[PDB]
Amino acid sequence: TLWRCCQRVVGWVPVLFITFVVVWSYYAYVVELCVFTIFGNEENGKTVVYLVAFHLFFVMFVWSYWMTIFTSPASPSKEFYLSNSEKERYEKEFSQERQQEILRRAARALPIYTTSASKTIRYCEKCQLIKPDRAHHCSACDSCILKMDHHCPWVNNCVGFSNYKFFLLFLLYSLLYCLFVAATVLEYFIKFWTTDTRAKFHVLFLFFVSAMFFISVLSLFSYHCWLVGKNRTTIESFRAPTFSYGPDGNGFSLGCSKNWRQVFGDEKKYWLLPIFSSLGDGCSFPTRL
Amino acid sequence: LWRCCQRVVGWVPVLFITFVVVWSYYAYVVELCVFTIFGNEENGKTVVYLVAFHLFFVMFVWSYWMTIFTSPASPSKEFYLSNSEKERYEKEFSQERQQEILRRAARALPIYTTSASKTIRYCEKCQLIKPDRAHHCSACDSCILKMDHHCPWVNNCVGFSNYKFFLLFLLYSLLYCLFVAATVLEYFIKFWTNELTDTRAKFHVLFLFFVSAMFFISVLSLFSYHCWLVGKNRTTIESFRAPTFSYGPDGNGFSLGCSKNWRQVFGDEKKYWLLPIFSSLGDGCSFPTRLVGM
Numbered sequence: 001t002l003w004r005c006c007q008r009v010v011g012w013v014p015v016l017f018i019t020f021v022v023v024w025s026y027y028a029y030v031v032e033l034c035v036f037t038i039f040g041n042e043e044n045g046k047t048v049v050y051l052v053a054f055h056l057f058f059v060m061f062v063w064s065y066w067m068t069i070f071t072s073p074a075s076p077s078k079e080f081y082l083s084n085s086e087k088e089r090y091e092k093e094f095s096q097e098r099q100q101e102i103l104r105r106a107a108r109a110l111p112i113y114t115t116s117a118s119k120t121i122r123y124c125e126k127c128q129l130i131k132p133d134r135a136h137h138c139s140a141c142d143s144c145i146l147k148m149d150h151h152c153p154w155v156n157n158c159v160g161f162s163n164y165k166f167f168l169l170f171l172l173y174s175l176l177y178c179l180f181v182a183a184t185v186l187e188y189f190i191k192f193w194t195t196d197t198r199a200k201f202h203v204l205f206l207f208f209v210s211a212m213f214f215i216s217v218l219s220l221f222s223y224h225c226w227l228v229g230k231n232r233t234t235i236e237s238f239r240a241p242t243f244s245y246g247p248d249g250n251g252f253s254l255g256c257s258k259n260w261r262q263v264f265g266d267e268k269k270y271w272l273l274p275i276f277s278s279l280g281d282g283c284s285f286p287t288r289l
Numbered sequence: 290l291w292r293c294c295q296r297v298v299g300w301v302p303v304l305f306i307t308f309v310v311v312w313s314y315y316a317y318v319v320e321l322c323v324f325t326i327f328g329n330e331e332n333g334k335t336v337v338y339l340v341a342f343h344l345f346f347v348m349f350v351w352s353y354w355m356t357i358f359t360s361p362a363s364p365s366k367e368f369y370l371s372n373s374e375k376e377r378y379e380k381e382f383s384q385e386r387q388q389e390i391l392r393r394a395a396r397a398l399p400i401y402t403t404s405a406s407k408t409i410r411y412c413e414k415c416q417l418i419k420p421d422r423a424h425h426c427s428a429c430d431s432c433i434l435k436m437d438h439h440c441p442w443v444n445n446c447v448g449f450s451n452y453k454f455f456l457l458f459l460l461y462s463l464l465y466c467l468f469v470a471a472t473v474l475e476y477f478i479k480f481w482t483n484e485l486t487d488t489r490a491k492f493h494v495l496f497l498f499f500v501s502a503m504f505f506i507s508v509l510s511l512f513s514y515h516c517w518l519v520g521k522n523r524t525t526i527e528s529f530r531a532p533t534f535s536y537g538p539d540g541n542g543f544s545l546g547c548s549k550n551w552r553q554v555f556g557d558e559k560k561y562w563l564l565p566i567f568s569s570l571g572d573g574c575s576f577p578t579r580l581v582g583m
């Protein structure tokens with residue numbers, strides 16, 4: 001009955017956890033490292049430079065992170081749904097052959113260039129719609145997601161056509177945020193090991209939390225730089241889409257340069273900003289052939 | 290009672306300045322940096338301007354806030370007439386013996402200055418003996434240590450506690466306005482000669498340059514005056530009426546040399562010089578004299 005409320009709340013636990021670490025990291029770097037440690041030293045130039053630079057990375061990180069969480073994933077348009085007449089004929093029908101004929105007649109009026117592994121029309125039983133190309137159903141979001149990449153638990157949201165560029169920038173600014181911390185706390189991490197009671201706990205934690213997050217998230221970032229240039233989602237990287245000419249891992253590829261511009265766009269000024277600049281509408285995609 | 294009315298109406302200059310500063314933040318960030326500069330298609334200057342602007346905007350609002358809410362220092366309870374001395378002072382009818390009551394108390398205090406008539410500097414309202422450089426302000430309704438002047442733009446007195454914050458407030462005001470004027474100028478040129486014609490951005494970019502230039506030219510004169518007062522170790526009051534010591538009036542009676550005079554306000558630790566954090570030497574109730582006696 002009330003299982004929805006607890007299920008919905010527990011989904012925010014990874015978000016609140018990450019949010020706490022970021023708030024703690026701000027307190028640790030600004031107060032403990034810059035004010036108590038670096039400003040505990042008589043160097044006002046080094047303290048200000050770090051504080052200014054830190055706020056630039058911290059803003060780009062929180063901005064990208066926020067956008068990846070609250071950008072709702074796009075769903076298929078009204079045209080892909082079975083009308084109340086045709087969905088009755090589909091539910092009334094018992095022969096799979098005639099079921100496929102119902103779906104094929106509506107789908108041929110839609111920009112669909114892919115089929116299932118069994119060359120059947122990609123259809124969603126729960127949503128009662130014909131899945132657009134690259135779209136998949138997520139049982140966590142309980143919906144079909146356009147150009148679905150994966151349901152990322154750390155943002156309590158699906159990473160799809162709307163989220164993807166924000167998700168990528170979130171990864172990018174995560175490495176930069178953590179690398180900058182590790183590179184600047186290192187000079188003082190060496191000193192802390194080789195004596196303030198409170199400052200050491202936060203500075204010691206600061207260096208290897210930033211390092212652990214760097215070495216971990218860096219693997220994912222290199223993974224997606226492959227994916228963007230190949231024009232493949234994570235789902236497609238495990239199951240290549242099947243076109244009219246058979247399976248093709250490169251069926252949506254337009255070349256390395258043009259594949260990136262499908263995600264980041266043609267406006268060069270928006271590439272590094274968590275502002276939506278992805279080409280297309282998510283319900284149809286340019287084909288290689 | 291109009292003292293209640295004074296408290297509310299006193300915030301009008303503060304709220305007015307707050308409006309101009311909030312408006313300046315919106316105008317420079319949204320209208321100038323987002324609509325105008327980022328429309329020109331290169332985010333290299335936009336990030337630099339947005340980063341630099343936030344450095345000056347923070348130091349300006351920080352200094353302004355500190356000058357407003359730093360309560361002015363008052364004389365210690367030793368400078369107040371005790372319940373014994375207030376009686377015999379009130380009983381006396383001869384002014385000559387009244388001074389002797391104040392003189393006997395003043396000689397137990399680190400006081401090296403008198404009035405122009407060589408009488409003990411005494412406050413009738415607070416019923417205390419004014420410390421050196423301290424003055425009574427009827428707006429604050431109190432005696433202010435090393436009082437410089439009552440400032441309406443901060444709804445507060447600029448005294449011993451405020452002065453370095455007030456100075457930083459002036460400094461970061463000039464820098465904030467100079468940075469705005471120097472960066473908006475190139476785009477101020479465009480709007481008049483119609484290289485840019487946006488309706489909303491024009492009002493804010495034009496007003497940004499005028500208001501920043503008008504505030505710069507005005508505050509710069511005041512700032513240079515106070516840079517000279519600090520080197521002379523003189524409050525604004527003292528620069529018009531030199532204090533009277535045991536050896537007569539002396540405009541330089543509190544001077545300790547140019548270097549040491551600045552250190553009285555900003556301190557010896559350079560890391561606090563530019564920061565709105567209290568670093569002034571002394572206690573405000575006594576000050577080193579040039580000749581002898583502290």
Ligand SMILES: Nc1ncnc2c1ncn2[C@@H]1O[C@H](COP(=O)(O)OP(=O)(O)O)[C@@H](OP(=O)(O)O)[C@H]1O
Nearest residue numbers: 419423424425426427428438439525526527529530
């Ligand atoms: N109620 C007040 N409001 C504003 N300023 C005051 C007030 N009372 C004294 N002052 C300041 O102190 C001076 C007034 O006379 P006093 O030297 O006796 O000071 P005081 O009575 O406050 O201790 C004024 O400065 P000026 O004569 O050199 O122009 C004034 O700035």
Ligand SMILES: [Zn+2]
Nearest residue numbers: 124127137144
């Ligand atoms: Zn679905």
Ligand SMILES: [Zn+2]
Nearest residue numbers: 138141151158
């Ligand atoms: Zn999902």
Ligand SMILES: [Zn+2]
Nearest residue numbers: 412415425432
């Ligand atoms: Zn008084």
Ligand SMILES: [Zn+2]
Nearest residue numbers: 426429439446
């Ligand atoms: Zn006052």
